[PDB]
């Protein structure tokens, strides 16, 4: 029924692209941080 973060990941991969806004809301209710994103765009960006 649940596990959150898959989901934004698995969708981000199949689309091949996600808007900077696409990840923000699709992120789990857990990490909301502003500087959180900074490195994780670099994470998703080397992979797709």
């Amino acid at each position: 029924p649940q596990s959150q973060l898959k989901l934004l990941v698995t969708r981000g991969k199949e689309q091949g692209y996600l808007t900077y806004a696409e990840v923000n809301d699709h992120l789990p209710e857990d990490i909301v941080d502003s500087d959180q994103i900074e490195d994780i765009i670099q994470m998703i960006n080397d992979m797709g």
């Binding site: 806004a21 923000n24 809301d25 699709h26 992120l27 209710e29 909301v32």
Partner: protein
């Protein structure tokens, strides 16, 4: 630009129970159990596209 939220959640904050929201955004279909073995009210235009 904030995080996405399910629409209906705002209506609840306006003091609308689920029944009220359904009452707002959906028409009604009346199911009558008369004598026995279900009867239904029919608006003749409801049968379009089905």
């Amino acid at each position: 630009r904030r995080r996405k939220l399910p629409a209906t959640i705002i209506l609840r904050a306006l003091n609308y129970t689920t029944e009220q929201i359904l009452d707002l955004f959906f028409e009604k279909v009346i199911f009558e159990i008369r004598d026995n073995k279900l009867q239904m009210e029919l608006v003749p235009e409801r049968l379009r596209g089905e």
